[model samples]
Target chain A: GKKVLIVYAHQEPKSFNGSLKNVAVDELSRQGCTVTVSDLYAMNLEPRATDKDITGTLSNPEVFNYGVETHEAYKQRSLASDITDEQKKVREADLVIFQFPLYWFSVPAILKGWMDRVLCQGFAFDIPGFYDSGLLQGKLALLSVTTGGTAEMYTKTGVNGDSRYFLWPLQHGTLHFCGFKVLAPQISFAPEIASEEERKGMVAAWSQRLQTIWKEEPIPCTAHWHFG
Target chain B: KKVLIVYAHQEPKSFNGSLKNVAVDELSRQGCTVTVSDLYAMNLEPRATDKDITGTLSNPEVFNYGVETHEAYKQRSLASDITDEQKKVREADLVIFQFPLYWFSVPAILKGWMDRVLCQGFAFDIPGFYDSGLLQGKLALLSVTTGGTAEMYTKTGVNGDSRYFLWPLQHGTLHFCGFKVLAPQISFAPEIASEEERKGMVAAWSQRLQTIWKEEPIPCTAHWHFG
Candidate 1:
């Protein structure tokens, strides 16, 4: 009973996000993990977090609080359905994965919609504070992302100069702010209609890396329960 | 003094609709005529399509002085050479954005609105002060509703409790327009809020907006307002 979840956001099943989902499902399940995949667009998940699901959520928002209005308990709205359905695995799993592609240097609209609505005032990050005591304080999150351009083009020294500038707001401002101990993300740049062999490399590499993390004790950021 | 409140809530029975009415009525009592756009009812498609693109001139046509830049952005502005929406945006002293915060940012249509109407050479293009700047000296404010309760978004609470989430919508977009931005009036968890709480928020907003139109603009480098 290995519990792990993947949150995926891509409207077109033919897009790279879909491929990432397929890669995650095949690899993680083969690793003897009970994996769940949340398909946000296909589910027609309500993207806006209204004052609707205050009491409907299960995970303590207080423990996961951020100073925003993104807290919703419905499966349709929680990142993707996979993360919401297997949240207990998120709490106890060896690795929690976020599979996505970079759209305009930000997460897809649905993922952002998830962050804006799921990362609530009391369920994700402690609003206006260090991540020492965030809602996702102990989870080990790894990002497997795909981008449209070559890695060389992402630099200001290159195309934008230092690609890390784009990741700051999402990783540091939002995710790190919530206390998820993030590992270096695995990026597959310029996956525009890559061949099966190329995608296979991505799946193989990501799968091996996740397996490595699972065997080790989860890394903690604050020395407490650990990770954002 | 007349102020136009362009309320874009999809349904009038909704809380945002009620709040919009409260604002318009309050402004009316204070001797201001509120022109409501009620965009949803007008069937104003927020999304800009190829039709919208082909409908305009080669590039975007922005505001020209003394042109009656009011009415359908696409239809009205086409005849006159100025940016239609920019004129409405400029003529009005105070502009209020009444919306339900969707996914931590502006809706695609609103974004398209800025992309379409707020062009270079007018909002800020050409020579002189008209360089890429927009809605000069106007006041922009937000009346938004969210689903999370006030208590939920605290430093000690579950989520990070800063209204910083609004930076993109407020500071990034509105401040870029050279408007004196004001602190927003937000009602937390309106759907689950008590009727008394909902109404109280509106009443409070009414009183606040009464003098906001004439409020002094915040001092900032003009460079920040324009390029």
Candidate 2:
């Protein structure tokens, strides 16, 4: 059975975001996939990157550097249990899905913290081992996002510009940089403003997509794709 | 002019810390009343939850963060920490974010600042975003340090242009809130640079602040970043 990990970051279980998460879990399980969900808010995951992330002796106690310290701890197998736990989930998963509302056109601070702390220099990518040659090259990643803006507002001539503009940083910079083949983002825009039927339709669409998700190809994830 | 620098870094001696220090020193020297929200030092809360609202939630059964925060903000019931940051933003004419870029965006703590502090009622409303944002006329700038070199951040380079990574932060967040966005000051690969080069980058930032008021805001459009 294929293993899937869903890193969920919404506070309310009754919210639209929560509905989508529930559908994904139900659908993926029906497809004979073993799924694990990291409910960040429920876990109260620590978001700040600090010396506390390292459990063992400091590499340089006088001058604290998060990246350097974490990298060393990762190598020494002394990273905080929470980070190592998430890293194990990433390592074991064939596909990882990030489900959250768009906060300032990006992931929520908690999810961003997950990306920052779990995906360290040695864990996610090394200096010369990033991009096409990243550590997680075989894994697939996808962003299931909900937005506050309408579809019209996210267009090219609209006030928010193209929706793809915001995806560049998360899809390409973080996910692609770490060598994950990024499936095209599943963006459900303005569900809060949609009718009850429309919201149901959006959830139904996601469920249908998951039935054939394995056949989908990763997007090009290029500047031209995002900008043009 | 008044300035608020929202800085995020773990150590005071790091390169990001140096950039933050230089900005405070330079802006203060120019007779600008500078306030620094050193996020790490403050142990700022980064998560958005029911706890952010002090009084009874609008709906105690179901926790909707945006809805509850917006209501709390309108009713003056938001947590004191969020209100305190909002006060700094309200009083400042310009806000500068200083930090090392993490995942092509602000650190989690600073991101939390934006999430909690810039709420529906404070930063922008349903029809009050983009040009008509609540924080209109305020200027916002991002002074970022990166681990990648200048060439690596170009169009043809592996990482794409540095500007590609900035669109969400600049146009989406800052411009969405009605702040006139200034061109970013990106100090590329400060950790790899020599001591002299690091000092030079800091000096250059200091020099730029001397005439910051005279500068014009960027267009903050897709063409400006991608083209």
Candidate 3:
């Protein structure tokens, strides 16, 4: 009964991240959830936010403000078809999941581009229309990330200093700003460094989690939750 | 000294453009050579793909981006665009990232530049990070213009403290790569501000640059920013 859109961004199909993506599709499919995967790297998704993103004449070609212009384009229905296509999927989906490796402690460029372009001001949020009162209120979003750092390294006193430190930007800034109820992230740490057995177990655990994903509660996506 | 401004914005006449021009003028006046990788104008490849590798892939059947890109960099077989940017970074004593904040972070194109250009072998080795990073002697700074105001970026503000959003960039990436990160220059709410306020922000940035080389790096850590 649930529709899920997995925005997957990894280059190798055989990599550990790929296995996670495949298992997500398989497990969700077996559970009768209609799943669509936007394999960004494979699809060669355009990552640049530019004037070209808006089709035809610019609202103010002389002084183009991406946030302002794209907002207008979304209202006028003049945004590039590629952007609209993804937006259509988001509109249809009940659950949205982002699957990727943490690049520089953030989402991959392609995935970031999807966020920047697709989640326009008019389309995703308006003035006084964010946080708890967001446009995509009913929808659920989850970040299933793979990191190069270990669990110990990502702790409070450790090197990366708690995974939540990095999550604020993605979970609060973008997703919560759009009003999507976010599930606590599933972080598979140091998959590249983990043993084959550990890697398989990580994927299996994700598959196992999907079985009860519907039963899971959304996290309180606030600065207190992230920083403290 | 050499400076590389990895700028990411569409309009040449925008607030971001003005900031970049100011940096260039100031740095040049100080007798420093400056290079700007205007990511939008150059249409820099934001996605790390098979095309980045000029030689045979380590895994032909499966494309692991980080793995492949790392190998390509070590082999010196990366695309010219990536190598070209890497060369600039290698040469620069200071690198300035000038951009308008989009979605509480750098634009995708600039993010891509960091992803692609700052590779495993190039920017950092497994052991060569933090104080011991490959580009340790170099300095990096994020000169960002936000749509939100300073009050809006406070702890009690809707967006939370600006420092919270800065951790990943300042600590995870810049410090990890060994560049001594100067305190970021965040010009808040330019689009909403008056022309005089905008000019003040621009002037403040230039004034900061005049004393930039004399300043010490911030202790790039979660404890320093958060606690």
**Full ranking by lDDT:** 2, 3, 1
User: How does the DockQ of candidate 2 come out?
Assistant: 0.85
Q: What is the iRMSD in Å for candidate 1?
A: 11.3
CAPRI class of candidate 2:
high
DockQ-best of 1 and 2:
2
lDDT of each: 0.55, 0.92, 0.91
User: Could you give candidate 1's per-residue lDDT for residues B1-227 as a string of tens digits?
Assistant: 54656565545677787788888888888887566655545444332222333243433333221122222342444323224455666567777888765544443334434444544433432232211345565667777787667786544444334253454445444654556666677788877788898778877877787777656644332222111
What is model 1's C-alpha RMSD?
10.6
Name the weakest run of 10 consecutive residues (lDDT summed) in model 3 chain A: A50-59
- In candidate 3 the C-alpha lDDT for residue A117 amounts to 87
Top candidate by lDDT: 2
Q: Between which residue pairs do clashes occur in model 3?
A: A12-B63
For DockQ, candidate 2 versus 3, the one ahead is 3
Model 2 whole-model lDDT (C-alpha atoms): 0.92
Q: Local error of candidate 2 at B79, Å?
A: 0.1
Any idea how many clashes model 3 has?
1
> Candidate 1 DockQ category?
incorrect
Error of 3 at B45 (Å): 0.4
lDDT of 3 by residue, A1-228 (tens): 899999999887887888899999999999999999999988788989888888877878889888888988998899998899999999999999999999999998999999998898877888979888888889999999999999999999898899999999999999999999999999999988999899889988999999999999999998889877
The i-RMS of every model, in angstroms, reads 11.3, 0.9, 0.9
